[PDB]
Protein backbone atom coordinates (compact mmCIF):
# COMPACT_ATOMS: atom_id res chain seq x y z
CA UNK A 1 0.00 0.00 0.00
CA UNK A 2 0.89 3.69 -0.30
CA UNK A 3 0.83 6.60 2.13
CA UNK A 4 -1.61 9.27 0.86
CA UNK A 5 0.62 12.07 2.20
CA UNK A 6 3.99 11.33 0.56
CA UNK A 7 3.36 8.40 -1.82
CA UNK A 8 5.87 6.21 0.00
CA UNK A 9 5.32 2.56 0.85
CA UNK A 10 3.50 1.69 4.07
Amino acid sequence: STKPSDGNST
Epitope: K3, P4, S5, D6
Partner: antibody, heavy 121, light 109 residues
Framework: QVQLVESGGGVAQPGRSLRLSCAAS????????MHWVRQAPGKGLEWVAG????????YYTDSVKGRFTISRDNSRSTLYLDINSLRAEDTAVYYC??????????????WGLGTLVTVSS | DIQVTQSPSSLSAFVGDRVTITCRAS??????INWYQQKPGRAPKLLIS???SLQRGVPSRFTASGSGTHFTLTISSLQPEDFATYYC??????????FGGGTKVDIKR
Protein backbone atom coordinates in the same frame (compact mmCIF):
# COMPACT_ATOMS: atom_id res chain seq x y z
CA GLN B 1 24.74 20.31 7.19
CA VAL B 2 21.45 18.40 6.78
CA GLN B 3 19.12 21.33 6.16
CA LEU B 4 16.42 23.15 4.22
CA VAL B 5 16.83 26.81 3.21
CA GLU B 6 13.84 28.91 2.16
CA SER B 7 14.09 32.04 0.02
CA GLY B 8 11.83 34.39 -1.93
CA GLY B 9 10.13 36.21 0.92
CA GLY B 10 9.77 39.95 1.11
CA VAL B 11 7.12 42.63 0.79
CA ALA B 12 4.56 41.99 -1.96
CA GLN B 13 1.35 43.77 -2.88
CA PRO B 14 -2.05 42.07 -2.60
CA GLY B 15 -3.08 40.57 -5.91
CA ARG B 16 0.50 40.02 -7.09
CA SER B 17 2.18 36.63 -7.52
CA LEU B 18 5.14 35.20 -5.62
CA ARG B 19 7.46 32.18 -5.80
CA LEU B 20 9.19 30.71 -2.77
CA SER B 21 12.10 28.29 -3.04
CA CYS B 22 13.49 25.77 -0.57
CA ALA B 23 17.01 24.35 -1.13
CA ALA B 24 17.67 20.92 0.43
CA SER B 25 21.16 19.70 1.37
CA UNK B 26 22.62 16.66 3.08
CA UNK B 27 19.96 14.00 2.45
CA UNK B 28 18.25 12.27 -0.48
CA UNK B 29 15.63 14.91 -1.33
CA UNK B 30 13.87 12.73 -3.91
CA UNK B 31 12.98 10.09 -1.29
CA UNK B 32 10.87 12.46 0.84
CA UNK B 33 7.44 13.97 0.73
CA MET B 34 7.72 17.70 1.34
CA HIS B 35 5.45 20.35 2.85
CA TRP B 36 5.00 24.07 3.36
CA VAL B 37 3.84 25.28 6.80
CA ARG B 38 3.32 28.95 7.58
CA GLN B 39 3.02 31.06 10.71
CA ALA B 40 1.22 34.40 10.68
CA PRO B 41 2.71 37.03 13.04
CA GLY B 42 1.78 36.11 16.59
CA LYS B 43 -0.20 33.02 15.55
CA GLY B 44 0.23 29.26 15.54
CA LEU B 45 1.49 26.97 12.82
CA GLU B 46 -0.74 26.36 9.78
CA TRP B 47 -0.02 23.55 7.33
CA VAL B 48 -0.70 24.70 3.77
CA ALA B 49 0.62 22.26 1.15
CA GLY B 50 2.15 18.84 0.61
CA UNK B 51 3.59 16.85 -2.26
CA UNK B 52 4.76 13.30 -2.90
CA UNK B 53 8.43 12.39 -3.28
CA UNK B 54 8.00 12.17 -7.07
CA UNK B 55 6.32 15.57 -7.56
CA UNK B 56 2.81 14.16 -8.06
CA UNK B 57 -0.22 14.42 -5.78
CA UNK B 58 0.13 18.02 -4.63
CA TYR B 59 -2.55 18.85 -2.07
CA TYR B 60 -3.52 21.94 -0.11
CA THR B 61 -5.50 23.35 2.75
CA ASP B 62 -8.89 24.56 1.51
CA SER B 63 -8.16 28.28 1.88
CA VAL B 64 -5.21 28.20 -0.55
CA LYS B 65 -6.30 25.63 -3.16
CA GLY B 66 -6.41 27.25 -6.59
CA ARG B 67 -4.04 30.01 -5.45
CA PHE B 68 -1.01 28.02 -4.23
CA THR B 69 1.00 25.46 -6.17
CA ILE B 70 3.62 23.32 -4.47
CA SER B 71 6.11 21.70 -6.83
CA ARG B 72 9.60 20.29 -6.81
CA ASP B 73 12.68 19.88 -8.98
CA ASN B 74 14.34 16.70 -7.74
CA SER B 75 17.32 17.16 -10.08
CA ARG B 76 18.09 20.39 -8.16
CA SER B 77 16.91 19.22 -4.68
CA THR B 78 14.56 22.22 -4.53
CA LEU B 79 10.95 22.69 -3.43
CA TYR B 80 8.76 25.53 -4.68
CA LEU B 81 5.60 27.30 -3.58
CA ASP B 82 3.91 29.46 -6.22
CA ILE B 83 1.21 31.89 -5.08
CA ASN B 84 -0.71 33.27 -8.05
CA SER B 85 -2.67 36.02 -6.23
CA LEU B 86 -1.61 37.19 -2.78
CA ARG B 87 -4.02 38.17 -0.01
CA ALA B 88 -3.36 40.14 3.17
CA GLU B 89 -4.02 36.92 5.14
CA ASP B 90 -1.02 35.29 3.42
CA THR B 91 1.40 37.33 5.57
CA ALA B 92 3.48 34.75 7.46
CA VAL B 93 6.85 33.09 7.84
CA TYR B 94 6.80 30.19 5.38
CA TYR B 95 8.67 27.03 6.41
CA CYS B 96 9.50 24.14 4.14
CA UNK B 97 9.51 20.82 5.94
CA UNK B 98 10.50 17.23 5.21
CA UNK B 99 8.16 14.29 5.81
CA UNK B 100 9.42 11.08 7.43
CA UNK B 101 8.93 8.27 4.86
CA UNK B 102 8.58 5.49 7.45
CA UNK B 103 5.83 6.80 9.76
CA UNK B 104 2.22 6.46 8.61
CA UNK B 105 1.14 9.67 10.30
CA UNK B 106 2.56 12.50 8.21
CA UNK B 107 5.47 13.65 10.40
CA UNK B 108 7.67 16.71 9.71
CA UNK B 109 11.15 15.85 10.98
CA UNK B 110 13.27 18.61 9.36
CA TRP B 111 12.45 22.32 9.06
CA GLY B 112 14.13 25.31 7.47
CA LEU B 113 14.59 28.62 9.23
CA GLY B 114 11.74 30.10 7.17
CA THR B 115 11.20 33.06 4.87
CA LEU B 116 8.95 36.00 5.75
CA VAL B 117 6.24 37.06 3.30
CA THR B 118 4.67 40.45 4.07
CA VAL B 119 1.59 41.24 1.96
CA SER B 120 0.84 44.96 2.13
CA SER B 121 -0.03 47.99 0.05
CA ASP C 1 -14.34 21.22 9.52
CA ILE C 2 -11.21 19.56 10.89
CA GLN C 3 -10.43 20.97 14.33
CA VAL C 4 -7.37 20.38 16.51
CA THR C 5 -7.56 22.02 19.93
CA GLN C 6 -5.09 22.07 22.81
CA SER C 7 -5.68 22.68 26.52
CA PRO C 8 -4.67 24.62 28.42
CA SER C 9 -3.61 27.50 26.14
CA SER C 10 -0.84 28.34 28.60
CA LEU C 11 0.65 26.99 31.80
CA SER C 12 3.44 27.91 34.19
CA ALA C 13 5.83 25.55 35.91
CA PHE C 14 9.01 25.52 37.96
CA VAL C 15 12.19 23.89 36.73
CA GLY C 16 11.53 20.34 37.94
CA ASP C 17 7.72 20.34 37.75
CA ARG C 18 5.59 17.83 35.85
CA VAL C 19 3.53 19.18 32.96
CA THR C 20 0.68 17.74 30.87
CA ILE C 21 -0.75 19.17 27.64
CA THR C 22 -4.02 17.93 26.10
CA CYS C 23 -4.76 17.63 22.38
CA ARG C 24 -8.27 17.17 20.99
CA ALA C 25 -8.21 16.45 17.26
CA SER C 26 -10.81 15.46 14.66
CA UNK C 27 -10.30 11.75 14.01
CA UNK C 28 -7.34 11.34 11.69
CA UNK C 29 -5.82 8.71 9.42
CA UNK C 30 -3.84 6.70 12.02
CA UNK C 31 -4.90 7.57 15.62
CA UNK C 32 -1.27 8.54 16.29
CA ILE C 33 -0.23 12.12 17.08
CA ASN C 34 2.82 14.36 16.69
CA TRP C 35 4.19 17.03 19.02
CA TYR C 36 6.46 19.92 18.04
CA GLN C 37 8.35 22.48 20.10
CA GLN C 38 9.02 26.10 19.14
CA LYS C 39 10.89 28.83 20.98
CA PRO C 40 10.37 32.55 20.34
CA GLY C 41 11.90 33.77 17.10
CA ARG C 42 12.96 30.20 16.21
CA ALA C 43 11.76 27.56 13.82
CA PRO C 44 9.63 24.67 15.09
CA LYS C 45 11.23 21.29 15.60
CA LEU C 46 9.78 17.80 15.85
CA LEU C 47 9.69 16.76 19.52
CA ILE C 48 8.07 13.31 19.54
CA SER C 49 5.74 11.16 17.46
CA UNK C 50 3.35 8.78 19.22
CA UNK C 51 3.93 6.54 16.17
CA UNK C 52 7.67 6.10 16.83
CA SER C 53 9.25 3.05 18.44
CA LEU C 54 13.02 3.44 17.94
CA GLN C 55 14.77 5.43 20.64
CA ARG C 56 15.81 8.62 18.78
CA GLY C 57 17.65 11.54 20.37
CA VAL C 58 14.52 12.28 22.42
CA PRO C 59 15.69 12.82 26.04
CA SER C 60 12.76 10.49 27.01
CA ARG C 61 11.28 12.75 29.71
CA PHE C 62 8.56 13.42 27.09
CA THR C 63 5.59 11.04 26.79
CA ALA C 64 2.79 11.10 24.20
CA SER C 65 -0.15 8.97 25.36
CA GLY C 66 -3.57 8.62 23.76
CA SER C 67 -5.43 7.45 20.67
CA GLY C 68 -8.45 8.46 18.59
CA THR C 69 -9.37 12.11 19.18
CA HIS C 70 -7.72 12.59 22.63
CA PHE C 71 -3.97 12.83 23.35
CA THR C 72 -1.57 14.19 25.97
CA LEU C 73 2.10 15.16 26.20
CA THR C 74 3.81 14.99 29.60
CA ILE C 75 7.15 16.47 30.67
CA SER C 76 8.44 14.80 33.81
CA SER C 77 11.03 16.99 35.58
CA LEU C 78 10.82 20.11 33.44
CA GLN C 79 14.23 21.54 32.50
CA PRO C 80 15.17 25.14 31.55
CA GLU C 81 15.39 24.41 27.83
CA ASP C 82 11.80 23.10 27.89
CA PHE C 83 10.11 26.48 28.32
CA ALA C 84 8.59 26.99 24.88
CA THR C 85 5.37 26.59 22.89
CA TYR C 86 4.16 23.08 22.01
CA TYR C 87 2.01 22.08 19.04
CA CYS C 88 0.23 18.80 18.45
CA UNK C 89 -0.40 17.70 14.88
CA UNK C 90 -2.64 15.15 13.16
CA UNK C 91 -2.70 13.85 9.58
CA UNK C 92 -5.70 12.88 7.45
CA UNK C 93 -6.64 10.81 4.43
CA UNK C 94 -7.73 13.73 2.21
CA UNK C 95 -4.67 14.09 2.54
CA UNK C 96 -4.02 16.98 4.93
CA UNK C 97 -2.10 17.91 8.06
CA UNK C 98 -3.55 19.97 10.92
CA PHE C 99 -1.77 21.68 13.82
CA GLY C 100 -3.27 22.46 17.19
CA GLY C 101 -3.27 26.05 18.34
CA GLY C 102 -0.30 25.59 20.66
CA THR C 103 0.39 25.59 24.40
CA LYS C 104 2.92 28.00 25.89
CA VAL C 105 4.85 26.74 28.93
CA ASP C 106 6.39 29.67 30.79
CA ILE C 107 8.47 30.00 33.95
CA LYS C 108 6.57 30.11 37.22
CA ARG C 109 7.69 32.57 39.90
Amino acid sequence: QVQLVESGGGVAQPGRSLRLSCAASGFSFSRHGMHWVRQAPGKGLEWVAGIWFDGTNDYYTDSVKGRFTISRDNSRSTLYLDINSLRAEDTAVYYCAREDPHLLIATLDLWGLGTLVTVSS
Amino acid sequence: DIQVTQSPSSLSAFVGDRVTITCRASQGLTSFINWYQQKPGRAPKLLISSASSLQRGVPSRFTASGSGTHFTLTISSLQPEDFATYYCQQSYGTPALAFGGGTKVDIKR
